[PDB]
Amino acid sequence: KTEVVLLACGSFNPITNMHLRLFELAKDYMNGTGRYTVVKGIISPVGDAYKKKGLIPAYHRVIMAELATKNSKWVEVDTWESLQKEWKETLKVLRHHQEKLEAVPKVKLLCGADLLESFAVPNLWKSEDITQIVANYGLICVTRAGNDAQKFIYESDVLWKHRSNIHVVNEWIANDISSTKIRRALRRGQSIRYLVPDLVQEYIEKHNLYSSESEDRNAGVILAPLQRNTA
Amino acid sequence: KTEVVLLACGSFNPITNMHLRLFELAKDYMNGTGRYTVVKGIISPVGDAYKKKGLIPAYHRVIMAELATKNSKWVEVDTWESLQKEWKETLKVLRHHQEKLEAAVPKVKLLCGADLLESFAVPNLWKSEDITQIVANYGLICVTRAGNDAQKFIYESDVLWKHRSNIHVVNEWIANDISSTKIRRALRRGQSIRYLVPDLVQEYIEKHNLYSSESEDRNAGVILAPLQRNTA
Amino acid sequence: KTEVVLLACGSFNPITNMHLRLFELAKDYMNGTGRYTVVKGIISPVGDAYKKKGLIPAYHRVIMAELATKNSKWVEVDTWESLQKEWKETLKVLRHHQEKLEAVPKVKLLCGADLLESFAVPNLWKSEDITQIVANYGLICVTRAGNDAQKFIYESDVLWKHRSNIHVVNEWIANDISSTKIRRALRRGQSIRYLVPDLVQEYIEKHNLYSSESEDRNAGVILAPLQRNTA
Amino acid sequence: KTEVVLLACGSFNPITNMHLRLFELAKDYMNGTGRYTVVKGIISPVGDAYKKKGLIPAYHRVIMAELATKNSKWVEVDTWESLQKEWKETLKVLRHHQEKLEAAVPKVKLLCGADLLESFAVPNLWKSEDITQIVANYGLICVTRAGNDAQKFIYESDVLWKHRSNIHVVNEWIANDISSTKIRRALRRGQSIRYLVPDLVQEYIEKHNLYSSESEDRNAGVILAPLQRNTA
Amino acid sequence: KTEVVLLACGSFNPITNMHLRLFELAKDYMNGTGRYTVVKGIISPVGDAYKKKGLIPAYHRVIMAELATKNSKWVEVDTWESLQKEWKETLKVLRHHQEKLEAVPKVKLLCGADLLESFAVPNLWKSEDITQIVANYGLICVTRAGNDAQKFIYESDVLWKHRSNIHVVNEWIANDISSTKIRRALRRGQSIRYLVPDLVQEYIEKHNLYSSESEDRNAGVILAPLQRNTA
Amino acid sequence: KTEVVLLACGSFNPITNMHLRLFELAKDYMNGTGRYTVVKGIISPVGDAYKKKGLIPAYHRVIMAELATKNSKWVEVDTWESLQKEWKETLKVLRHHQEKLEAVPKVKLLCGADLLESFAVPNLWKSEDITQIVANYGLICVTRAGNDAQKFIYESDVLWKHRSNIHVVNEWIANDISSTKIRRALRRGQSIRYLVPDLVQEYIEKHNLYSSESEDRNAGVILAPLQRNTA
Numbered sequence A, C, E, F: 001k002t003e004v005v006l007l008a009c010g011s012f013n014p015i016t017n018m019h020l021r022l023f024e025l026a027k028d029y030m031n032g033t034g035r036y037t038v039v040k041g042i043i044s045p046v047g048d049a050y051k052k053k054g055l056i057p058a059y060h061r062v063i064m065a066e067l068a069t070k071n072s073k074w075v076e077v078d079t080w081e082s083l084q085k086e087w088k089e090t091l092k093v094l095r096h097h098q099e100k101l102e103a104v105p106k107v108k109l110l111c112g113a114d115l116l117e118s119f120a121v122p123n124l125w126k127s128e129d130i131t132q133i134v135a136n137y138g139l140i141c142v143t144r145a146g147n148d149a150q151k152f153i154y155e156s157d158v159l160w161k162h163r164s165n166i167h168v169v170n171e172w173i174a175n176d177i178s179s180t181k182i183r184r185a186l187r188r189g190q191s192i193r194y195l196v197p198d199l200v201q202e203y204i205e206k207h208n209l210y211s212s213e214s215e216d217r218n219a220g221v222i223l224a225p226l227q228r229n230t231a
Numbered sequence B, D: 001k002t003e004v005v006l007l008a009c010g011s012f013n014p015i016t017n018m019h020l021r022l023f024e025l026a027k028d029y030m031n032g033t034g035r036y037t038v039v040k041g042i043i044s045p046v047g048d049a050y051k052k053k054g055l056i057p058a059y060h061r062v063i064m065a066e067l068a069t070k071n072s073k074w075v076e077v078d079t080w081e082s083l084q085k086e087w088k089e090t091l092k093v094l095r096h097h098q099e100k101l102e103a104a105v106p107k108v109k110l111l112c113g114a115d116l117l118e119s120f121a122v123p124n125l126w127k128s129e130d131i132t133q134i135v136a137n138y139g140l141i142c143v144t145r146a147g148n149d150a151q152k153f154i155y156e157s158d159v160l161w162k163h164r165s166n167i168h169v170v171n172e173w174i175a176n177d178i179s180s181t182k183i184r185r186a187l188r189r190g191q192s193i194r195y196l197v198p199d200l201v202q203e204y205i206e207k208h209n210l211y212s213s214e215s216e217d218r219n220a221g222v223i224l225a226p227l228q229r230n231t232a
């Protein structure tokens, strides 16, 4: 039994019952195989240097993530990436956490099908990064469209070559709570109770974090990866 | 502005984040129209006499229902229906809760999902005069991710179309079908249901080891009360 | 009860039973809610300055629309828009009619999901026009794809905000009869009997209205709204 | 070039613009093949003994069809079927018309939609030899918005496939689904059906209040003539 | 590395390129996992006592299967099952082959989604049988409807419990050369060249194997398993 | 009864069972109408000047095609195109074969829906060519998506006008053995047995024809037709 640490890189703008649900799913799955033992889950909010449209301050995303995991036994938040001045490629974030653990459980990227399929977006990922991520760390991709993910893997010689290191976990409970729809809801003043944890909902309301204004941040700006990989 | 009470009659076996979500959605919709003011939400678990397959004992359901709403300022649980000896037609439950409020009165509206609305078509499941009285004298607030289907269903029925002003279809754009069936199945397999139900409900289920192959077989082969009654 | 005037701006190239049907449905719906009284329907053909491809001359489209409503006891044609020298924004046509009335029924725009959704085409509609149209006048969107329309409304903050003034009318008897299909059938010599009013059909035949030639009109030209919100 | 007569057997309860289009489309298609010449169209309302649910008196349906075709240069109404005390099988109506033409003779083909074609699979509705003789000795011109389905249906039936040269599937690219059922529903609800049926038909219907809750109940609980007779 | 024998029970009425393809796919998948070595493939035609409608005599089906595998280096036909007088439960056919080997490679059932899904048909399979098959042997399900097969496994407690002994193999190159379609094609005189091995094709033509008559076989008769488990 | 010659122009990179099926289907269909007699089938591999990505040498494609039709009674391979130093438009290939016959059966282009639909790709086919192909020769289009091909025809005035020369043939036994998927399987060391003829699979295996390298042939080069028609 290989000891494993699930590392989820994402914006968590805001984290929702779905992001937490991701970790629960992956763990049951990996433990389920019998060849693994999930020892820890790490949430690592992206730094504001990412420049994603509508992205609020990493400070709030970390806090929410922390509040969301306050009662979680095995999942926690790591603020290293967010406190970085420069936007860090996910490969580097994976590396950092592997090297950290050697101061040995293997670190795997926890993600959804959107992330996996974004590999095809021109210039979004350095192709070597793709190879090294799946080759040297591996993905645990959770999804409600298991077949599209499986099809995407089958259509890429690189992903197919390292398929033993890419695990597609089916989500049979059609979870669709996206960050975007949560933000839309708040702007219109609708309830989001039961879509995010109580403390996260309470934290958000109290400070009216999301608004038309916030949704506008980085508007007109190129996504970090895109700028760096074209420049 | 009309004050209104949303009454959700269901099995809640078990209740999940989605049932709680149904109430939040319906209240936002109603208050948002500008002509209503939602004052209270009432969860009324069905009596064990319903005989639905896999239906665990009514008392546990009420508790999880109460646990899930312990921190709910406006939604509460009512045990009147579950305490009755014979299975209770939804129309009577609605009536009971309306008479009860008249003691300037708020109106009780049946809160439900599309499946319940559409079940009106199952032969011998609902007495036709009951449907008529429900939509005419109380009304339905139907939450669902299949809006056209609910609208179509209503459109295909003369009685529903006729009382269409008393039937409100509320769209759930943030789909999340956390159904009881899938929760029960996850539990039978020792999978986590954390974040699918409120923490206290999860824990309650844990401790009492509520769901299993055994519980799921309850009533196996027994005809559903309504069907049994309405056919006799 | 609020009196209302249904106004439909469009090309009507050519008007079909579908357009007339649109008015009947919107009227039934608005009078059905119990809180409106539809006192009139107005068809306003777009001027040739619109420059849409295949658009035949305005006078032909006005006459056909007039022939079509000759036997309507409540729907009529208004030629203001079509007589202006420069193409006119729909907000301007709505405003013209609302004022002409105040010389009071409320003018509401009658349209299909199509136009509703063109609100998203880059540079087709000025964002303030949309806000003013939905907030100050109103929209009655008649369509077969009700969920698509509802969804479109849900996905936009302005529309959602003024949703109380937007009405989606389900067309349960799915009819299509698009102008494009009618011109296509005419080019092929196929029968359009029962798809348009006999008088319109007879006129189309008398003047041999539609052909490959007519179809090339404004070929290459940039649609007025676009030329204007760009240029 | 083979001269053809398009015969449409149906309830026409009531006739709508869709039934008229049907003839237009089929005529264009047959003439467009370069191998046929459509000389006449025939609308044949079914007699009351068919016993279909909601079927109003035959005499009215006949009058509506005549009103509907008053301005048609080539489609006409035949009452033979409406005057039969015992419901007649479509194969018999086809034979009746062909024998009539015989009195260089045009061939009678059945004009219908996908619904009638696929109804061939309903248990007991059509005697198997009837299906065989109709497709082998007369022919079908099936108009539909679902061409692949109709082809699939044909492909899945040894008899249909065998005689596929006599079954013409005609694509309806301008979708039209003005069903009689949706027309009656509209009328019961006091909705406008203008532009969905010809003006004279709408006017006749409105003048005599032909469609209502009561008319819709006609023959409720009764078994459709073909089914009763083929199960006897 | 576990050695495995893929056993496929079926009617093979007639066998086709797709049944052969099934074995190739399963083999590539199982060997590809890096923890299996497929040492043999076994085609076990069903006996005539099965009474399935349209089912021609076993001797013709066995012979066609041998002609089909004459040129296979690893797939062969086993006639045991078909030589029995009473129709044999698939679990028994499996137990048989496993014991015959123990005279050790593990035998697994090779099948398509249909068979897997027919596990839900009332009275078709004894539930103890379903449990012993997946628990004691294994199922390699090859299919175009991967997610459906997966959903079906997810919806059954028995199958889910032993999911580790069940492998859904995706068939990215869609094939649907069903026997039913082959028979239908033969009845109408259509070519089946390139859908079945040339020798099978030649055999079918020489003995005029399929027709309306043959299709009538067992018409009205109750399929053996239903008869048994029911009476 | 008009005699007809089926001419399939294509890359055949490599030829598969599906291309062979195309001929069987088309022939059963045309002879089935009762008004045509299919006298011959011609497979015509494109020349290397076509420059399609992943196209291996013409000599090999021609050999695989010869190997595949060795035992065919009526389908042969014509090498004219493969020997052209300049890529030839399909209209010319049709004209080459038609005059050759006039040295009288009519040659018709056999193809699938992809090819037919490619008629709409900007600059791929000269409009006059499309016209002449369907006006003067004819297309027999075999496909799993008949309505899509029928709709494509209905939406084009030229195709519709000569619809009597375009025969859509339904493929009820769904088969999608694309060359792209065959090459994918080969690069991955997967079996392609029973998807292509035995001799073809053996020739491919013996020469390692398909690989990552072969797949890069012509990368970045513009397809002959596009280059020529844009120039």
Ligand SMILES: NC(=O)c1ccc[n+]([C@@H]2O[C@H](COP(=O)([O-])OP(=O)(O)OC[C@H]3O[C@@H](n4cnc5c(N)ncnc54)[C@H](O)[C@@H]3O)[C@@H](O)[C@H]2O)c1
Pocket (backbone or CB within 6 Å): A009, A010, A011, A012, A013, A018, A019, A022, A045, A046, A050, A052, A088, A089, A090, A091, A110, A111, A112, A113, A114, A115, A116, A118, A124, A125, A126, A129, A142, A143, A144, A171, A175, A176, A177, A178, A179, A225
């Ligand atoms: N290294 C690179 O080149 C590169 C390029 C682009 C992005 N990235 C990284 O990718 C991340 C982008 O994250 P994001 O903006 O989408 O974060 P997010 O907050 O939207 O989502 C976090 C994770 O949840 C998954 N997810 C979302 N909805 C889901 C659902 N319903 N079911 C299952 N999974 C679901 C997402 O696919 C993702 O893996 C960042 O960490 C970024 O740095 C890296």
Ligand SMILES: NC(=O)c1ccc[n+]([C@@H]2O[C@H](COP(=O)([O-])OP(=O)(O)OC[C@H]3O[C@@H](n4cnc5c(N)ncnc54)[C@H](O)[C@@H]3O)[C@@H](O)[C@H]2O)c1
Pocket (backbone or CB within 6 Å): B008, B009, B010, B011, B012, B013, B018, B019, B022, B046, B050, B052, B088, B089, B090, B091, B111, B112, B113, B114, B115, B116, B117, B119, B125, B126, B127, B130, B143, B144, B145, B172, B176, B177, B178, B179, B180, B226
């Ligand atoms: N009076 C009668 O004749 C009659 C006949 C049948 C049933 N009933 C009543 O109907 C109820 C049946 O309840 P049940 O067994 O389905 O309860 P349930 O616990 O499964 O569901 C509770 C409610 O949740 C809604 N819901 C579930 N998933 C949803 C989703 N994804 N989106 C939106 N809404 C969703 C359901 O429609 C229902 O209204 C009982 O109270 C019963 O007594 C009455």
Ligand SMILES: NC(=O)c1ccc[n+]([C@@H]2O[C@H](COP(=O)([O-])OP(=O)(O)OC[C@H]3O[C@@H](n4cnc5c(N)ncnc54)[C@H](O)[C@@H]3O)[C@@H](O)[C@H]2O)c1
Pocket (backbone or CB within 6 Å): C008, C009, C010, C011, C012, C013, C018, C019, C022, C046, C050, C052, C088, C089, C090, C091, C110, C111, C112, C113, C114, C115, C116, C118, C124, C125, C126, C129, C142, C143, C144, C171, C175, C176, C177, C178, C179, C225
């Ligand atoms: N003010 C602006 O910025 C702006 C920009 C673009 C367009 N416009 C206006 O929009 C109009 C464009 O009209 P068009 O060319 O599409 O007119 P049209 O003749 O094609 O159609 C007229 C109306 O019918 C509706 N319709 C058509 N088929 C329908 C169906 N099956 N169901 C329901 N509705 C259906 C259309 O959506 C539209 O509202 C013009 O008046 C133009 O000036 C205004």
Ligand SMILES: NC(=O)c1ccc[n+]([C@@H]2O[C@H](COP(=O)([O-])OP(=O)(O)OC[C@H]3O[C@@H](n4cnc5c(N)ncnc54)[C@H](O)[C@@H]3O)[C@@H](O)[C@H]2O)c1
Pocket (backbone or CB within 6 Å): D009, D010, D011, D012, D013, D018, D019, D022, D046, D050, D052, D088, D089, D090, D091, D111, D112, D113, D114, D115, D116, D117, D119, D125, D126, D127, D130, D143, D144, D145, D172, D176, D177, D178, D179, D180, D226
């Ligand atoms: N001989 C027999 O055994 C047998 C058995 C059953 C029915 N029938 C005959 O079938 C007829 C039943 O007619 P009905 O009740 O359905 O009549 P109807 O008035 O509803 O329909 C008339 C025709 O319109 C076609 N149609 C409907 N919608 C269409 C659309 N959108 N596009 C194209 N075509 C469309 C229908 O398929 C039908 O052929 C009667 O003549 C009856 O006697 C005969």
Ligand SMILES: NC(=O)c1ccc[n+]([C@@H]2O[C@H](COP(=O)([O-])OP(=O)(O)OC[C@H]3O[C@@H](n4cnc5c(N)ncnc54)[C@H](O)[C@@H]3O)[C@@H](O)[C@H]2O)c1
Pocket (backbone or CB within 6 Å): E008, E009, E010, E011, E012, E013, E018, E019, E022, E046, E050, E052, E088, E089, E090, E091, E110, E111, E112, E113, E114, E115, E116, E124, E125, E126, E129, E142, E143, E144, E175, E176, E177, E178, E179, E225
């Ligand atoms: N033990 C029991 O209770 C029980 C009950 C019913 C059936 N059975 C057994 O099941 C078998 C039934 O076989 P059949 O008549 O369906 O066999 P078949 O000849 O049609 O097919 C043989 C195999 O091919 C698979 N297959 C067919 N087309 C496929 C495709 N396109 N993709 C992938 N796989 C495909 C089928 O699922 C099957 O496993 C018999 O051996 C029978 O005895 C056992």
Ligand SMILES: NC(=O)c1ccc[n+]([C@@H]2O[C@H](COP(=O)([O-])OP(=O)(O)OC[C@H]3O[C@@H](n4cnc5c(N)ncnc54)[C@H](O)[C@@H]3O)[C@@H](O)[C@H]2O)c1
Pocket (backbone or CB within 6 Å): F008, F009, F010, F011, F012, F013, F018, F019, F022, F046, F050, F052, F088, F089, F090, F091, F110, F111, F112, F113, F114, F115, F116, F118, F124, F125, F126, F129, F142, F143, F144, F171, F175, F176, F177, F178, F179, F225
């Ligand atoms: N004259 C011109 O302007 C012009 C322009 C482009 C292409 N072309 C010609 O078109 C051909 C292009 O061939 P290709 O590279 O696509 O050939 P290919 O080898 O991929 O396939 C050959 C044929 O098989 C058909 N086919 C493939 N999969 C099928 C399936 N599942 N079902 C049914 N049919 C199927 C294709 O549609 C095609 O007609 C060449 O001959 C080329 O010269 C001519």
Ligand SMILES: [Xe]
Pocket (backbone or CB within 6 Å): A018, A019, A021, A022, A025, A142, A171, A175
């Ligand atoms: Xe999730």
Ligand SMILES: [Xe]
Pocket (backbone or CB within 6 Å): B008, B018, B019, B020, B022, B023, B111, B112
């Ligand atoms: Xe609920």
Ligand SMILES: [Xe]
Pocket (backbone or CB within 6 Å): B018, B021, B022, B143, B172, B176
């Ligand atoms: Xe919900």
Ligand SMILES: [Xe]
Pocket (backbone or CB within 6 Å): C008, C010, C018, C019, C020, C022, C023, C110, C111
């Ligand atoms: Xe309109």
Ligand SMILES: [Xe]
Pocket (backbone or CB within 6 Å): C018, C019, C021, C022, C142, C171, C175
């Ligand atoms: Xe319409």
Ligand SMILES: [Xe]
Pocket (backbone or CB within 6 Å): C066, C070
């Ligand atoms: Xe007029």
Ligand SMILES: [Xe]
Pocket (backbone or CB within 6 Å): C119, C120, C156
């Ligand atoms: Xe918008």
Ligand SMILES: [Xe]
Pocket (backbone or CB within 6 Å): D018, D019, D021, D022, D025, D143, D172, D176
């Ligand atoms: Xe029609």
Ligand SMILES: [Xe]
Pocket (backbone or CB within 6 Å): D047, D082, D083, D084, D085
């Ligand atoms: Xe009669």
Ligand SMILES: [Xe]
Pocket (backbone or CB within 6 Å): D120, D121, D157
């Ligand atoms: Xe049939």
